[PDB]
Amino acid sequence: TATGRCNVTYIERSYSNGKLQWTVTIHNLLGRLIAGQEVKAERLPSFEG
Amino acid sequence: LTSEKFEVQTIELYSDPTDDVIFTRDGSLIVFENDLRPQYLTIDLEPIS
């Protein structure tokens, strides 16, 4: 997001409403997270979170 | 259409090789174990006179 970028060691994803819920696993945080944040993958352009 | 109306995350994908023998490559690492997932291996037999 705006607040920063950090790397995820792996994700699990579990079910709410039938859309999966990815629950990732990260090292650290740059900047204060927010519920809504504008998300993009550092490594990938294609994905959106 | 998107994922909510879909249920399961991990789907065994079924395929029939043109090949008798299977080739591991990179992170392509075959495994057999049973107790955890039995549903792949099935042994059957006919006793004979």
- The reply to whether B4 touches chain A by the CB within 8 Å rule is yes
What resolution (Å)?
Answer: 6.8
Positive or negative CA dihedral for B28, A24, B9, B36?
A: positive
Ramachandran quadrant class, B46 (left: phi over 0; alpha: psi -120 to 50; beta: rest) = beta
Angle among Cα B2, A18, B27 to the nearest 5 degrees reads 75
The approach used to solve this structure was cryo-EM
Tell me how far apart the terminal alpha carbons of chain A are, to the nearest angstrom. 10
Report CA dihedral (A40, A11, B41, B21) to the nearest 10 degrees.
50
Residues on chain A touching B11 (C-beta within 8 angstroms): none
Burial of A6 (0-12, 13-18, 19+ CB in 10 A): middle
Closest CA to A1 of A24, A31, A21: A31
- The reply to whether B25 touches chain A by the CB within 8 Å rule is no
